Each structure stands twice: as structure tokens, then as C-alpha cells.
Amino acid sequence: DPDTAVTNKQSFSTDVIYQVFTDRFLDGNPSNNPTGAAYDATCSNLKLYCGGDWQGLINKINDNYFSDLGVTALWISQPVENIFATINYSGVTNTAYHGYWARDFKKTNPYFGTMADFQNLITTAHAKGIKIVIDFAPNHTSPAMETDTSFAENGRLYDNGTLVGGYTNDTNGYFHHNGGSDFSSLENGIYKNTYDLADFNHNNATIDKYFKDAIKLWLDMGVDGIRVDAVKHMPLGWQKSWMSSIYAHKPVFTFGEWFLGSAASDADNTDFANKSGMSLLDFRFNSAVRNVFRDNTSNMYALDSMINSTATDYNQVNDQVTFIDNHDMDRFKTSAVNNRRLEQALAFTLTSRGVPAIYYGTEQYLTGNGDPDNRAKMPSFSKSTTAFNVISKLAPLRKSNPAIAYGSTQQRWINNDVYVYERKFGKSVAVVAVNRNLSTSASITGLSTSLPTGSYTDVLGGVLNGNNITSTNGSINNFTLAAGATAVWQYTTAETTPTIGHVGPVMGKPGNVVTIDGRGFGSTKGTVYFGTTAVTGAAITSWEDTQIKVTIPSVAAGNYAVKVAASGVNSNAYNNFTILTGDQVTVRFVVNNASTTLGQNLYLTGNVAELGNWSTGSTAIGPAFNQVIHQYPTWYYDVSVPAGKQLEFKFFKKNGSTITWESGSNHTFTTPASGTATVTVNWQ
Numbered sequence: 189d190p191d192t193a194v195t196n197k198q199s200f201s202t203d204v205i206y207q208v209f210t211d212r213f214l215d216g217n218p219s220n221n222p223t224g225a226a227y228d229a230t231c232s233n234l235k236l237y238c239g240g241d242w243q244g245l246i247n248k249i250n251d252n253y254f255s256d257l258g259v260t261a262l263w264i265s266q267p268v269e270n271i272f273a274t275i276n277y278s279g280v281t282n283t284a285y286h287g288y289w290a291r292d293f294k295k296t297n298p299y300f301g302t303m304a305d306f307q308n309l310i311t312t313a314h315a316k317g318i319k320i321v322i323d324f325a326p327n328h329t330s331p332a333m334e335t336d337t338s339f340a341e342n343g344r345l346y347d348n349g350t351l352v353g354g355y356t357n358d359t360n361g362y363f364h365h366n367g368g369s370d371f372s373s374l375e376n377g378i379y380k381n382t383y384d385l386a387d388f389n390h391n392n393a394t395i396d397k398y399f400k401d402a403i404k405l406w407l408d409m410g411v412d413g414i415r416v417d418a419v420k421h422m423p424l425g426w427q428k429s430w431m432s433s434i435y436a437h438k439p440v441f442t443f444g445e446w447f448l449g450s451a452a453s454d455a456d457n458t459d460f461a462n463k464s465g466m467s468l469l470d471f472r473f474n475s476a477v478r479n480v481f482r483d484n485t486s487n488m489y490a491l492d493s494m495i496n497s498t499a500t501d502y503n504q505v506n507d508q509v510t511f512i513d514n515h516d517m518d519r520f521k522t523s524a525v526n527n528r529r530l531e532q533a534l535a536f537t538l539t540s541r542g543v544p545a546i547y548y549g550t551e552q553y554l555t556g557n558g559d560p561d562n563r564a565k566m567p568s569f570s571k572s573t574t575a576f577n578v579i580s581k582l583a584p585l586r587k588s589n590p591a592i593a594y595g596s597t598q599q600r601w602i603n604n605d606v607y608v609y610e611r612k613f614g615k616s617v618a619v620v621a622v623n624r625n626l627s628t629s630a631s632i633t634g635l636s637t638s639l640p641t642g643s644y645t646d647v648l649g650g651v652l653n654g655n656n657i658t659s660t661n662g663s664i665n666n667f668t669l670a671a672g673a674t675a676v677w678q679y680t681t682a683e684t685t686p687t688i689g690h691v692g693p694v695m696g697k698p699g700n701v702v703t704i705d706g707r708g709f710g711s712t713k714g715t716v717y718f719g720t721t722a723v724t725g726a727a728i729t730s731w732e733d734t735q736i737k738v739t740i741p742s743v744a745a746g747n748y749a750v751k752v753a754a755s756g757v758n759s760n761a762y763n764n765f766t767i768l769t770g771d772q773v774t775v776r777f778v779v780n781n782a783s784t785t786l787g788q789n790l791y792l793t794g795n796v797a798e799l800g801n802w803s804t805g806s807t808a809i810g811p812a813f814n815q816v817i818h819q820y821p822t823w824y825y826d827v828s829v830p831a832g833k834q835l836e837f838k839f840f841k842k843n844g845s846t847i848t849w850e851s852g853s854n855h856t857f858t859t860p861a862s863g864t865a866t867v868t869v870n871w872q
């Protein structure tokens with residue numbers, strides 16, 4: 189199967205996501221709508237249910253709405269059964285229409301459909317060539333008041349019906365009872381509740397087990413991806429472990445939400461994208477795009493910085509999910525914001541690097557500021573807007589031109605209002621030109637590109653005042669970029685020499701299968717290389733010009749580059765491939781009376797790659813935590829370690845450039861065969 193087929197659940201660079209709020213989209217079956225109290229046919233009051241079910245989506249896939257639009261994967265609301273309670277916050281009734289108030293992750297939401305309607309969604313969606321990504325929020329259940337079982341459902345969790353436990357009288361400790369998080373530090377936010385939400389304690393083997401089993405269920409149904417909610421509030425140590433159990437079963441493209449406010453680099457968010465085993469939702473990109481196009485609080489140089497910076501901070505910038513707006517922010521379209529600016533932010537987004545995502549109704553210039561006005565009902569299904577055109581003309585390019593899916597980025601011309609970037613992959617090229625100034629045109633002169641000699645037509649057909657150009661060895665003739673224009677020029681040619689574009693997942697135990705998508709491979713099963721180690725024959729399950737499928741060799745856990753050899757020809761390397769020692773389990777390391785000075789931080793390292801291999805660098809584990817679960821001088825950290833394995837390790841303080849190890853002999857610990865465990869030691 190081609191890299192671009194609908195069966196490629198490990199890569200989305202060729203796709204375009206359509207994030208839909210199931211409820212707010214289309215009531216396709218009124219028999220499932222709730223009774224009275226928490227239902228609104230007029231869908232006037234936005235906090236209550238409105239209808240929108242899975243059938244409506246099926247109705248819309250079938251009647252070709254998404255096909256003429258060009259989106260190739262829909263990202264729906266958390267499918268699990270939510271709480272039926274009606275919560276009343278300061279006078280106003282609130283319901284679980286958003287899907288985030290999980291109750292029992294093992295069943296379907298009756299208001300959205302049944303297991304059978306759910307299969308239908310898959311089968312139908314896959315038939316029309318559309319992947320299904322689903323939201324999943326394992327950080328919590330639902331709102332709950334510790335001292336009041338009457339308040340909502342008291343975060344009660346069920347296992348396919350059987351009541352596991354509530355928030356009050358939570359003896360087994362399936363949740364944290366450390367009060368409300370005030371978001372002052374990263375750890376304050378992982379171990380304390382987020383809003384009034386019952387926070388799960390993933391160090392409880394029962395919970396750890398529950399979730400690994402729950403997600404299995406949804407994967408076995410055929411979902412093509414997962415959008416993990418609030419990844420910023422769960423331990424990376426546990427999520428990594430969770431993530432490897434997923435990649436060991438049925439690997440799908442997983443990306444999580446690490447909510448950021450600005451476009452600036454962020455240490456933690458970057459360690460997460462690189463070390464977790466998943467990619468994030470690109471909030472830095474969203475700020476840039478919004479500042480330049482919507483808000484007008486920055487210029488084009490801010491875009492170029494964000495492009496250059498994010499490529500440097502993320503091991504795979506291509507796995508980040510971009511978007512101009514979403515359900516947790518003001519809708520891009522507003523009274524001041526001109527229709528053309530939205531159309532440009534859309535063009536820019538669709539042609540930029542990473543997996544693009546489009547919040548529903550953007551193609552209809554839908555507005556609404558704040559939650560819940562941003563989550564209004566789909567006002568119409570007209571396939572007539574200009575925005576609809578832009579999406580339907582550019583979106584297919586991800587599937588046709590590899591420079592748009594896999595390509596690198598590079599500025600070719602710029603000033604405060606105009607940006608001209610090139611996207612290239614091997615011989616395939618894509619130039620994009622944008623003039624956000626809506627009143628003054630621009631005289632672009634002296635512009636190089638990698639478009640071979642020829643005459644180029646604006647792929648957009650000029651819907652956005654774009655023009656056609658002429659190359660003479662990349663040298664582009666002088667031309668006037670129209671006011672508010674944006675044009676796209678391209679060139680594409682069947683690649684002959686091998687070249688990798690994307691690998692996924694990019695983590696896993698030897699024995700798993702990873703997908704090496706690319707071009708110019710060949711029809712004859714050649715040789716995959718994890719660094720210096722060769723792979724051939726049976727180990728390679730599939731081999732085509734566009735996509736190889738290989739079995740991770742059984743070699744020393746660690747970072748590795750990935751090369752492919754097409755008949756004596758070595759390709760470019762895909763760096764940062766993490767190979768795990770094998771099945772993972774989360775483990776909480778605790779250390780007593782580890783006094784430290786001002787600015788001095790604790791870290792952890794051991795005798796396996798998962799711990800860094802006696803490293804004190806970035807492969808090390810830390811800094812540790814010393815506030816919520818355990819208090820300073822006692823530190824602690826949740827880490828993903830190999831299962832059933834004798835381990836050695838020491839802690840060390842790293843204030844400035846200097847290191848100081850705990851003395852004596854290494855601490856030892858043999859990990860469980862599955863689950864989680866807490867290990868405590870004293871600072872030697």
C-alpha cells in the first residue's frame with residue numbers, strides 16, 4: 189500500500205484533519221437524543237446537548253461533503269460513555285456534550301451512538317478513504333466535589349458497567365486528593381486536579397491496567413489515530429509506558445495537547461515531543477499564524493522565526509499538528525478579521541510542514557468567542573465559500589506533492605507583509621507566496637527558487653488573486669504580487685533514487701513493526717539499517733517504491749538513525765529512532781533526605797537506555813519533583829523502565845556545570861513483569 193493510502197495508520201503528513209464536535213455537527217438520528225432537561229433542538233443554549241451523533245457524520249461522508257472538501261481524516265469527540273448527570277455551575281446548567289467527562293471508557297456514548305454505529309463510522313469512513321482520529325482523555329473522569337457525593341456523579345469510574353470507584357471514600361486511591369492545581373509549576377499541574385476534574389493516579393496498577401486495556405478496545409475497532417487530552421497534566425514517565433503498550437499492539441499515530449500561550453520555545457514541551465513517544469499539537473505555530481494573520485500583533489519575520497525555531501527544537505517537526513483555531517479559543521473569524529485573512533491563514537497552514545487540522549465550520553466563516561460560543565452548531569453545509577475552495581484545492585496537494593508532506597522549509601523572499609517559502613523533497617518543489625497587506629500590492633524582484641526552468645500556474649487557479657510565473661533555472665521573472673494575494677507554484681517528478689520522508693512510530697521494542705514512508709525506494713526488497721545494523725528478507729514484511737514495513741531488530745536499546753538501501757544506493761538518514769529494551773512498566777523512584785543548595789537539582793540515571801546509561805546529559809532523568817506527592821528533601825519521579833529487569837542507579841545533583849553523585853554502591857531494583865511500582869531509597 190502507498191504511503192498515501194487510507195490504511196497508513198502510522199503517518200498523517202499526507203492527510204488533512206477535520207476536527208469535529210460530534211454533537212454540534214449533525215443530528216442524524218433523533219431517537220438517540222437526550223430527554224428534556226439537557227437537550228435543545230434549537231441548539232440555542234450552547235452548554236446543553238443539541239443532537240449531533242455518528243449517523244450524521246456517516247450521512248455527511250456518504251453524501252460527499254468531506255470528499256468535495258478534501259479532508260482525509262476526521263477527529264471526533266471522545267467516543268466513550270460520559271456522565272448523564274446535569275451539572276449546575278452558578279445558575280447555569282451544564283452537560284457533557286463535549287465528551288470530556290468520561291465515566292466508562294469501555295462503552296460507547298449512547299447519545300453519539302452504539303458499538304454498531306461506531307463500526308459503521310469506521311467501515312464507511314474507510315470506504316470513502318478517510319481515517320478516524322479520536323479524542324481520549326485519560327487524565328480524569330468528571331467534575332467532583334470530594335466532600336459531596338451529590339455533586340454530579342462524583343467522578344465515578346466504571347469498567348464496562350462494573351463500578352470501580354468514586355472520588356469520596358477512595359480507599360484504593362485511584363485518584364489524587366491533593367486539591368486544586370493552581371498551575372504555578374509543571375508538577376503542581378500533574379498531581380493536582382485540573383479544574384474540578386477527578387484526577388487519576390496512574391501509579392495504581394489497576395488504573396494503569398485499565399487504560400492499557402481500554403485503548404486496546406478502541407484500536408481493535410479500527411481507529412486510525414488518537415488525540416490525547418491534557419498530556420501536560422499527566423506524568424511523561426507513565427504516558428511513555430502507555431505509549432509503548434500501544435505501539436506493541438496496533439501502532440497508530442498519536443499526538444497530544446500541550447497547551448501553550450505564546451510562540452516562544454518551551455523547554456518542557458520540547459522534551460515531551462522528543463521523549464514521550466508522541467507528537468504534540470503545535471501551539472507555537474498557532475500563535476504565530478494568529479499574530480500575523482488575525483490579531484496583527486506581529487509581522488512576517490515572526491512567522492519565519494517560528495518556522496526555523498520549531499524545526500530545531502523538535503526531532504520530527506513533521507509530526508506536529510498545526511491549526512489556526514480550536515475549541516479552547518476564540519474562533520479565528522471575527523468582526524475586525526477580514527475574510528481574506530482567514531483564507532490566507534488556511535492556505536499557509538495547509539501548505540506548511542506538519543499534519544494540518546481544521547476545526548469544523550472554518551470553511552463556513554463561523555464565529556464565536558470563548559467556550560462555549562466557539563462550539564456552535566454547523567450553520568450550513570454549503571460547498572460555495574471561498575474558504576471551501578482553498579481547502580479543496582490545496583488539501584489534495586499533501587497527497588500528490590511529497591514536498592508538501594515531507595518537505596523542508598526555506599525563505600526565499602520577505603519583509604513585514606510578504607513571505608515566500610519553498611518546500612522541497614528531492615526533485616519535488618512547492619513555492620508559496622503571501623501578501624497579507626490588503627491594500628498595497630508588491631513588486632517582487634530577484635527571486636530564486638528550485639523550480640526547474642518552465643512556466644508555472646498558480647495551483648489555486650487565482651481564487652486568491654494569485655498570478656502565474658516563469659522560471660529560468662529557479663530564477664523567477666519580476667512580478668507584482670497582488671494585494672492580499674497568495675499563490676502556489678509547484679513541480680513534481682517521479683523520484684528514482686531512494687529517499688525517506690517519514691518514519692512512524694519512532695519508538696519501540698525490537699520485534700515491533702515501524703513504517704518507513706518515502707519515495708524512490710523500489711520494487712525489490714532491499715536492506716533497512718538501524719544505524720550500522722542491517723535488516724533483510726523476512727524482517728521486511730513489505731517493500732514498495734513508496735513505503736517499506738520493517739521489524740525492529742533485536743539490538744541494544746538506544747537512539748539510532750534509520751537508513752534505507754535501494755539496490756546499492758544509500759538514502760538520507762531519519763535520525764532519533766528510539767529502541768526500547770522491551771516491554772515497559774512505569775516506576776516511581778523516591779529518594780529521602782537529598783538536601784541540595786539553591787539552584788541545585790536532582791536527577792536520575794541507571795544501567796539501561798531508558799534511564800540514560802550512566803549519562804548526565806539529556807538522556808538523564810529529571811529534574812525530579814519535591815512538592816506535591818513527596819516533599820523536599822524527599823524527591824521523586826515517575827519513569828518508564830524495562831519490565832522484569834534488574835536495575836542499577838544513582839541520583840546526582842547538577843547545579844551549575846558541576847555534578848556530584850551519591851556515594852557508595854549503586855542502588856538496585858528488579859521491576860515487575862507488568863504494571864507499576866514505587867521504589868524508595870536514601871541518598872547515600
Ligand SMILES: C[C@H]1O[C@H](O[C@H]2[C@H](O)[C@@H](O)[C@@H](O)O[C@@H]2CO)[C@H](O)[C@@H](O)[C@@H]1N[C@@H]1[C@H](O)[C@@H](O)[C@H](O[C@H]2O[C@H](CO)[C@@H](O[C@H]3O[C@H](C)[C@@H](N[C@@H]4[C@H](O)[C@@H](O)[C@H](O)[C@]5(CO)O[C@H]45)[C@H](O)[C@H]3O)[C@H](O)[C@H]2O)[C@]2(CO)O[C@H]12
Nearest residue numbers: 277286288325383384417418420445447448449515516559
Ligand atoms: C482548557 C485547557 O486548560 C488548560 O490550558 C491552559 C494552559 O495549561 C495554561 O498554560 C494557560 O495557557 O491557559 C490554558 C488555557 O486555559 C489545560 O492545559 C488544557 O489541557 C485544557 N484543554 C483540554 C481540552 O482541550 C478541553 O476542551 C477540556 O475541557 C472540558 O472540560 C472543561 C472543565 O469541565 C470545560 O470547561 C468549561 O466548563 C467548566 C465547567 C468551566 N469551569 C468552571 C468555572 O468556570 C471555573 O472557573 C472553575 O475553575 C471550576 C470550579 O469552580 O471548574 C469550574 C470552564 O470555565 C469552562 O471553560 C470545557 O468546556 C470542556 O471542553 C479539558 C478536559 O477535558 O481541559 C482539557
Ligand SMILES: [Ca+2]
Nearest residue numbers: 217221239241
Ligand atoms: Ca442525535
Ligand SMILES: [Ca+2]
Nearest residue numbers: 378387421422
Ligand atoms: Ca493528572
